Amino acid sequence: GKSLIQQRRGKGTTTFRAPSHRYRGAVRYVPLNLVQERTLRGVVEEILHDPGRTAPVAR
Amino acid sequence: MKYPKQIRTYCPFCKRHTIHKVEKVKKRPRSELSAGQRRFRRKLKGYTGFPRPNPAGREKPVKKLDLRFRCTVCGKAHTRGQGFRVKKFELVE
RNA sequence: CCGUACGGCUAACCCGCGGAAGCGGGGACAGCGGUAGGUGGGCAGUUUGGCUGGGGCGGCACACCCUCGAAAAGGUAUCGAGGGUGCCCUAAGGUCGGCUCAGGCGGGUCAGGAAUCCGCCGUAGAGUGCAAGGGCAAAAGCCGGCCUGACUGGACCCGUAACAGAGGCGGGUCCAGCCGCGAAAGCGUGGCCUAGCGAACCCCUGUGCCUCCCCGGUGGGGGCCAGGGAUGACAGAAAAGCUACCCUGGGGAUAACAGAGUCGUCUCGGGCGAGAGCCCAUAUCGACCCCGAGGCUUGCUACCUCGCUGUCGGCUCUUCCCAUCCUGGCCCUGCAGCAGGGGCCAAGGGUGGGGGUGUUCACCCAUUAAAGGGGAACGUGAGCUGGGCUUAGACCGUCGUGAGACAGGU
RNA sequence: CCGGUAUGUGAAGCCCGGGUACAACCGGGUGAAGCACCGGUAAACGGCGGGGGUAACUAUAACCCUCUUAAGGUAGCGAAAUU
RNA sequence: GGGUGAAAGGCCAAUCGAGGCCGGCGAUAGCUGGUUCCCGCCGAAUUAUCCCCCAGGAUAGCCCGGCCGGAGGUAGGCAGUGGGGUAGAGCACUGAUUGGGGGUUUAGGGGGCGAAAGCCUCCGGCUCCCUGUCAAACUCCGAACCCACUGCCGCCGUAGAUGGCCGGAGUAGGGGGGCGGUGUAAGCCGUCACCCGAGAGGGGAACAACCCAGACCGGGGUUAAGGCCCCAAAGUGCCGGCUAAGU
RNA sequence: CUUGGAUCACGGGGCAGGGAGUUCACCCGAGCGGCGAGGUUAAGGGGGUCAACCCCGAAGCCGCAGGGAAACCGACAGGUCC
RNA sequence: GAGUACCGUCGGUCGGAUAUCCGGCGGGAAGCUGGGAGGCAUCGGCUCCCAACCCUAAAUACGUCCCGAGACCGAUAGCGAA
RNA sequence: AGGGGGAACGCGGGGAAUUGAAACAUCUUAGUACCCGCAGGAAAAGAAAGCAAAAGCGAUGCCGUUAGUAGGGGCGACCGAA
Ligand SMILES: [Zn+2]
């Protein structure tokens, strides 16, 4: 027979691939390496809309 | 159909007439040491479609008897004629 | 001493952070490799029979026995006519002896008497293990006795299948061996005769012998002879469907389709005379039963055409037949007149317009002298149209597990 | 389709016995998944029939029991793109 | 056997219910088409059994070539020795089928004088005599005809019979005419083995198989089928009779 | 092709050239020829006027003895008649 | 001369059949008083050999080239290409 | 030092279906077509842990026989050594 849409998704083509190049970066915590017990401090500069996050991000 | 348990008949080993006990032959399965079974088993191995016919549902409603007649003097058995078909078979005095 | 499960641990292995060293989390699980069972149209390869007054549904004429067909030797077919077998029996098998049946009548029981008792007549009008046909009476039938020849080793011949070929399967005539019955002669290799059944390879059992790679032993294998285990599509594949998206090769050896043939049916008639018609067969009507014409309806058949044209209806245009609806001329009448019925001669002319429906036909409307019916490849697509019908798209109902289908609708 | 479960069945492996100077081989036991068994699920696939009888005269079976079967077409719509 | 698809099996270079190019590949088919000079000798078959067999094959039958062998054979007829159950006929068995008489009178429903199955009748069965009819699956009878065998006639045969061996085939859709079963019929299925197929010529107006008749080449004659008014070779022929409808 | 062809059954506008039972292996027969209870060489070797010719080479194959699954056993070269 | 000889199981291949060779997986020796083979496995004899390391000419296969020859074709033929 | 190229011949791995069995699944087609890697003018093999059987032989390769034999195989079609 012929293939299903979810079978065609696994091969990873532009028709099924995420346009991550349009997105703000990935959101991750700082690593424990640098935060053994240091307790850094920061300040918020700006709040931004992200097209791949379903939520706003802050710098 | 009724049939006697003992009969007086010719014995080919004693070469006279003696009394004979009647027995039925008991069937038994295929021996694995036999050459036909060896060949079947070595052709059933590996990647292969089934290599032989397989008749399922092949049973005559009525079969022929397989009778043997054992002498009391000599201890040996023989067969007596061809087999005949009948559904019921009772051994009686 | 062997296992199984439960609990915990970290050092293998795994996951994350890391430039790395190392840290954190999991943890002998998972993952990886080998093997064993299940599930598995997700993916492949195949099969899905034949005969057939086309094919399919149906049936089996797809293995056998009897009567007819069948033509007084033999042989002879059809989805020809009438029916049966796919068993049963330790006796319904072998032999010896003795006896004779069905029914009816006359006596005696008695609801017919179904059966018992008596005598007579009685060529079988009975019975046989089962179909049909054949055979049979001091019997092949009934009543009893004794038995297992329903056996082992082997030859030859006949039939299935004539004449004229056959594996397997039936059957017949005998030779030896060992036995049964009988006084003896004689009979006995199943059932009075003709139906009741099956290759190769493989396996099981019996029995006595031969054999396994230099030799000899043991366990286990292979071989020769005999009997059993099955293939009814019965001289024997292991086996479900749809295609209206369909393709290739062919077929007029075979349907739809017009034509040829035929005429059961269809359209149109006749003979005779029961009667109906107040009486009066025959103005008119005319039962039951018999005899026909045409080829314009439908069927039957399968001679012609398998890319001749494969179409219905309508519009347009031409022509022919008469079994005459009107128009011309006549006859009878249960014809006063007006009109009506029925019949004869005559085909020169006429036979139209509208509503619903793809319609032909049929139905209705208003007029009209009347608003007849058929043929010409169901006249006419190198003349038109394209509403129906009969491809590929889609919806409803019903049937189907489903893919799908419907001489059902849109 | 999902879940659960004492028993049963259940291949290889393992164990026991017999056999073989050893093996092949024979019998039994244990043996996961799955099957079996017990339950839930229809905006899952699907189904929603049968009778034998009718109260006041012309028709009504409009009401009530029944035995078949898991149950027996509710509201609406109806000669329908379904007759 | 993959892509893509707002899903039509739509589109992927005029190619899609699995693209195009080359290769496997001179794939396979029991189905269709084709197969090249002359004369001469002989000359068929479409029917039985078997096959997942019915548009195909095998075994036999029917043709041809060569050899062996050595004395008979039998397509016709006569006489006899035996066999048969068709046509016809008939009722002696099996089964059917009209009616009138003489009887037992009854198993049995209506009954009637039934003081209640009753003795008497009564419609009904069975039994003999008449009377009128039948048979593919009936027969007390029974042909023509066919078959086997013996002898003789005839014909064939030592210029080689019956037969036997070796080898090469083709034929497995038949048709007309007569007979039989079936069918409204046409047709379907068999049978015989004369013809067409595979057969010229002379006639039926023309006609595959109806009649005459079987063919090397050139000539001369006599007949056959049929025909003799003209077409058209040969008679407007003879005797006796009929028809008036171009029958 | 077909039971059946002048067919409203298929192929057929003209001319010239091309165009269809071949080769090998095994088997069954025959028309000739050689040797004959025996017949015959293969690969190869030697010589030569050097792919033709002559001489060697009997390995093997068929036949002379068959029957039998096998172990095994093991026959008239002529007695009589037509 | 060791994950070797050998044992079992799976897959492939072979004429190799209970008796061919290769590979995967699980086991796994003796080692000179030593070890292997002899078509099912084991026992006894007899015969023949010494694996698990390495190298080696000639006799053979071919012809994009060269030489020679031909009962080969003779311009629609012969290689597609005179 | 290696890489790339070379008609046929050579070595090592991967590996179908048409077709035949008058269907078809074991089988056959076939270790074939095709694919990947590696060399040379030749490559590969090669000096018995062998063949045999009362006798013995003495590495390897090639030709002729052995032989359509032993043997494999829906023991069918066919396949096939030393
Ligand atoms: Zn005895």
Swiss-Prot record, chain A:
Coiled coil: none annotated. It comes from the Archaea. Belongs to the universal ribosomal protein uL2 family. One of the primary rRNA binding proteins. Required for association of the 30S and 50S subunits to form the 70S ribosome, for tRNA binding and peptide bond formation. It has been suggested to have peptidyltransferase activity; this is somewhat controversial. Makes several contacts with the 16S rRNA in the 70S ribosome. Part of the 50S ribosomal subunit. Forms a bridge to the 30S subunit in the 70S ribosome. This is Large ribosomal subunit protein uL2. It comes from Thermococcus kodakarensis (strain ATCC BAA-918 / JCM 12380 / KOD1) (Pyrococcus kodakaraensis (strain KOD1)). The chain holds residues 2 to 60 of 239 of the full protein.
Curated annotation (Swiss-Prot), chain B:
Its cofactor is Zn(2+). InterPro entries: Ribosomal_eL44, Ribosomal_LSU_eL42, Ribosomal_zn-bd. GO terms for cellular component: cytosolic large ribosomal subunit. Pfam families: Ribosomal_L44. A zinc finger (C4-type) spans 11-74. One of its GO terms (molecular function) is zinc ion binding. Binds to the 23S rRNA. Belongs to the eukaryotic ribosomal protein eL42 family. This is Large ribosomal subunit protein eL42. The lineage of its organism: Archaea, Methanobacteriati, Methanobacteriota, Thermococci, Thermococcales. The gene is rpl44e.
